[PDB]
């Protein structure tokens, strides 16, 4: 199956006394493997997955070094951005940055991307060609012209297309037993009587990995997008995910409803009924 390595940075300003909060997390597909928190004791990049604990001190000194260098770049940003938006020094503000690379099932590069945000809205992003930039505001355009001059896209492309995909492939084989393993959803249905003449039919998908799942309900063979309640996929807390799809059925006719589960670890999709 395909794979991705992504980094999420969140810098939040605390106007009044010190420094921003800087959170950084790294993910290989839906497994998190590292973190850095500005207010954590260590002041180092910490292992959040067993297969990365076996990395060298040199790795951990390199990654601790880069992530806090990255922290300070964002600290300058919250001020500069405040300048760009003519904002006061009394209000808290948030910068988010996300970049990563996608590799196919051949482990040969697919996409690269870098997007940046101010106060939960888009600010600037690298386009799918890894050459040009999408600037949102006129402030974002000043950043575009800076990064255009400093040749950030040319450097960033080399990262996404080179050392990202390389170290991603490495993670994959080093944590093979978890990362390259598809946990198929453990399905089952339930039936609660809503009244004397109606019932909720709820279809479950539990302890699956990766997070991608298409849970679909249908009646007599045709899709039932109506009277379906579909919750967003949630973490179970052990690294697998969960999800349910429910439909309100008139009593005595549960037999015509089928739940359909599609997930990367099922050779053929599941069709389960209630009887």
């Amino acid at each position: 199956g395909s794979h991705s390595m992504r980094y999420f940075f969140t810098s939040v300003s605390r106007p009044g006394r010190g420094e921003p909060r800087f959170i950084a997390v790294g993910y290989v597909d839906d497994t998190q493997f590292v973190r850095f928190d500005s207010d954590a004791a260590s002041q180092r990049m910490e292992p959040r997955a067993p297969w990365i604990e076996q990395e060298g001190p040199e790795y951990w000194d390199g990654e601790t070094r880069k992530v806090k260098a990255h922290s300070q770049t964002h600290r300058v940003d919250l001020g500069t951005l405040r300048g760009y938006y003519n904002q006061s020094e009394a209000g808290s503000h948030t910068v988010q940055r996300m970049y990563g690379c996608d590799v196919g099932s051949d482990w040969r590069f697919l996409r690269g991307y870098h997007q940046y945000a101010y106060d939960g809205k888009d600010y600037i992003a690298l386009k799918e060609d890894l050459r040009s930039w999408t600037a949102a505001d006129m402030a974002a355009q000043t950043t575009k012209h800076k990064w255009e001059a400093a040749h950030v896209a040319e450097q960033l492309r080399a990262y996404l297309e080179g050392t990202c995909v390389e170290w991603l492939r490495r993670y994959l084989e080093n944590g093979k037993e978890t990362l390259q393993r598809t946990d198929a959803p453990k399905t089952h249905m339930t039936h609660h009587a809503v009244s004397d003449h109606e019932a909720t039919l709820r279809c479950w998908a539990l302890s699956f990995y990766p997070a991608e799942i298409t849970l679909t309900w249908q009646r007599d063979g045709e899709d039932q997008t109506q009277d379906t309640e579909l919750v967003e996929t949630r973490p179970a807390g052990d690294g697998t995910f969960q999800k349910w799809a429910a439909v309100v059925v008139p009593s005595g006719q549960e037999q015509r409803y089928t739940c359909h589960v599609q997930h990367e670890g099922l050779p053929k999709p599941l069709t389960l009924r209630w009887e």
Partner: peptide, 10 residues
Amino acid sequence: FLPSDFFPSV
């Protein structure tokens, strides 16, 4: 594995 800070500030 992280890139370096080739990113200028904004």
